[PDB]
Amino acid sequence: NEYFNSINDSKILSLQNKKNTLMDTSGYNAEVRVEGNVQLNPIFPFDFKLGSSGDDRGKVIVTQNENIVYNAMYESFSISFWIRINKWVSNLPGYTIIDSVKNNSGWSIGIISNFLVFTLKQNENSEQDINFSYDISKNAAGYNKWFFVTITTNMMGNMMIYINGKLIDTIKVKELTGINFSKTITFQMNKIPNNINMWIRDFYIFAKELDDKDINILFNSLQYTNVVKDYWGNDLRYDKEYYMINVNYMNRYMSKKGNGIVFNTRKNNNDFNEGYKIIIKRIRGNTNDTRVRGENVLYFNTTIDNKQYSLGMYKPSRNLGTDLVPLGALDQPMDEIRKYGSFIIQPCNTFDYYASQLFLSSNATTNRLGILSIGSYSFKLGDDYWFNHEYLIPVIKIEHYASLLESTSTHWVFVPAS
């Protein structure tokens, strides 16, 4: 795969984490100082963490050698990295997160409100910037997911910004005389006059202008595709409590009536703190390392009252439709769970969310009998006696699901109860 090699040749700075230490694996060997409280993840993705807290707070400084800066100080360059910010609310005040400016000239990345802005500066008067705005409708609880930023900048060409491989906003670079690029880049959360976290990982800078096919290769090479992710982009894990949500129904939480699992309307969308939680339990794995991966056969438990149930098929009070059968909370032994409560997970990640599809399994094997979806149906549950009622329920389509195989009503996400 030379495509990958051709890009790496142009790499002037590669801020990676090896041996539990931040360093420059570019080969040009930059200086990396780690001041303050900077958590460093031992587990992949070997990310490093920073805060907005006062006093001793995290600071990472990187100093590049004069020779290699001077050459690339006026031509073409790109910046690419993974970022995550927790409680990135829409009313958030302005912050500078990554900054590379010495004497009123350079480049600077910052976040304010629903915007992540990238400024280019020459002097104290004039400055040209590009930004990415997050869709507040889709992210009422805050844009708290991991996302991969890529900024290409050609000095007499174009200055574009990418998120997750998708081009977002693009503007024309202005005449910038007297623009001196600093030899220092500082990762630190500094407020702007008039408690959040930030995770960074794989901060690369290139000496050329990367194209669409290059960016998207980079994006895809820099993730484990077969590791299913939670809502925020972290490795989805077994034996961990999550809130199970359908992509088409982000304003519903999970509840129970009789044997039936029923979805209900969230009171608010500040937090995800509502309804019953589930735990994912493993059955069959190509690997056995706590992480949930594609083609793993699995099942779901959940503690409702002081009992613990497992999600599994049941016979509804009347027929809901052809080949259609509801999923519910059942107190069933492992033999029943293998017949009627096992699923095969497949990751499905888009620009909007990190989700997954769930296929009904045949006797806990990877052979597929159906697909887990969601719908509103009229039947009896619990104390219901006189009339049928409409319930929004999880439902498995059996045998013929090629239609639903592409529907976003089959995309499920998992939000931790942290």
343 neighbors 360 (Cβ within 8 angstroms): yes
Do 154 and 218 fall into the same domain?
A: yes
- Cβ contacts of 214 within 8 Å, gap of 6 or more: 3, 7
- Collapsing DSSP to helix, strand or coil, 396 comes out as strand
Do 106 and 133 fall into the same domain?
A: yes
Tell me the C-alpha to C-alpha distance, in Å, between residue 77 and each of 17, 65, 165, 290, 313. Answer: 22, 16, 17, 40, 55
326 neighbors 380 (Cβ within 8 angstroms): no
Tally of structural domains, the chain: 2
Residue 95: beta bridge partners?
Answer: 111, 191
Do 219 and 330 fall into the same domain?
A: no
Q: Point out the domain boundary residue: 230, 261, 292.
A: 230
Tell me the C-alpha to C-alpha distance, in Å, between residue 216 and each of 164, 228, 294. Answer: 8, 19, 22
Do 225 and 235 fall into the same domain?
A: no
Do 69 and 218 fall into the same domain?
A: yes
Q: What is the CATH number of the domain that holds 14?
A: 2.60.120.200
Q: How many other β-carbons are positioned within 10 Å of the β-carbon of residue 363?
A: 11
- Collapsing DSSP to helix, strand or coil, 260 comes out as strand
Q: How was this structure determined?
A: X-ray
Q: How far apart are CA 212 and CA 158, in angstroms?
A: 13
Strands of 59-63's sheet in order across: 31-35, 59-63, 184-191, 95-101, 106-112, 115-121, 127-133
Q: How far apart are CA 314 and CA 395, in angstroms?
A: 10
Q: How far apart are CA 28 and CA 14, in angstroms?
A: 9
Do 260 and 138 fall into the same domain?
A: no
155 neighbors 75 (Cβ within 8 angstroms): yes
Q: How far apart are CA 343 and CA 358, in angstroms?
A: 6
Do 192 and 237 fall into the same domain?
A: no
Boundaries of domain holding 324: 231-418
Q: At what angle do helices 212-221 and 2-9 cross, to 10 degrees?
A: 100
Do 115 and 29 fall into the same domain?
A: yes
Do 163 and 292 fall into the same domain?
A: no
Q: What tokens appear for 301 in the block?
A: 């438990």
Q: Point out the domain boundary residue: 214, 230, 246.
A: 230
- Collapsing DSSP to helix, strand or coil, 390 comes out as strand
Do 340 and 205 fall into the same domain?
A: no
φ, ψ at 209 (rounded to 5°): -100, 110
